[PDB]
């Protein structure tokens, strides 16, 4: 018996929005310490990783480990029905063929009950962790979003360069080139605008803009994005739920 009751229906809606455009069919391994999910895109370049997060629910009852294979398009359609704001509780039995999504309003009866047929994958359960990153940074997610959207007009490839006290995003194409340079700072009165950098060694990586445009959709989840980069490892892009996370693992362009 699963009873994942969210405080806010938009919260689950916002989570799923960060996935839907890169991955379609995905298993949601419910445990008793929350819900873990993981999926790879078709090109085998981007891995999405989710972790909620008992404290991100109002309540979370889950008697026994349960896997919910869901088509995210179908799930979206149901998550558009969230009369914002409304409490959303996910109900599913121990051996489920469907998932009940219940929307309740504070003043009721104004109850909405949706049912969604499950699909079975047939996945990896690929829990592999964790690497040594050359540099790790955090900046406002909306800032990182604009940077990616802007540079994407210039090229199919975006370069990320970390030197001493410098984070540099570069794009180069037919039109011409573009460079965004940001330096670490803290504003004590507005710590959420801060740019933080930790460097063990410099990094020169080049990424598919196609994938980064998808990654920055996690912007709705957190006002900050964490970025960890290695010379010979996939990049990690992370938006923090409070608490839990949404993670993206990207393969860079080599040779």
């Amino acid at each position: 018996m699963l009873e994942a009751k969210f405080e806010e229906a938009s919260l689950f809606k916002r989570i799923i929005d960060g996935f839907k455009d890169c991955v379609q069919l995905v298993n949601f391994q419910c445990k008793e310490d929350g819900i873990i999910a993981q999926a790879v895109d078709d090109s085998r370049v981007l891995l999405v990783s989710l972790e909620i997060g008992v404290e991100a629910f109002q309540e979370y009852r889950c008697d026994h480990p349960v896997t919910l294979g869901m088509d995210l398009t179908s799930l979206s359609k149901i998550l558009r029905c969230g009369n914002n704001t409304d409490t959303l509780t996910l109900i599913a039995d121990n051996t489920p063929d469907s998932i009940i999504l219940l929307f309740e309003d504070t003043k009721k009866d104004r109850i909405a009950e949706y049912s969604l047929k499950l699909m079975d994958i047939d996945a990896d359960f690929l829990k592999i962790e964790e690497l040594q990153y050359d540099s790790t940074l955090s900046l406002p997610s909306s800032e990182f979003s604009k940077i990616v959207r802007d540079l994407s007009q210039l090229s199919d490839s975006i370069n990320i360069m970390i030197t001493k006290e410098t984070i540099k995003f570069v794009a180069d194409g037919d039109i011409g080139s573009g460079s965004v340079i940001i330096k670490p700072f803290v504003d004590m009165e507005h710590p959420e605008t801060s740019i933080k950098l930790e460097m063990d060694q410099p990094v020169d990586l080049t990424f598919g803009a196609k994938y980064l445009l998808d990654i920055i959709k996690g912007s709705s989840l957190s006002d900050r994005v964490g970025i960890r980069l290695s010379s010979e490892a996939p990049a990690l892009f992370q938006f923090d739920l409070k608490s839990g996370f949404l993670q993206f693992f990207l393969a860079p362009k080599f040779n």
Binding site: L46, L126, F249, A251
Partner: peptide, 11 residues
């Protein structure tokens, strides 16, 4: 321009 690698190189 570098060519796109997959995530197979790391599993």
């Amino acid at each position: 321009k570098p060519k796109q690698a997959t995530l197979a190189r790391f599993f």
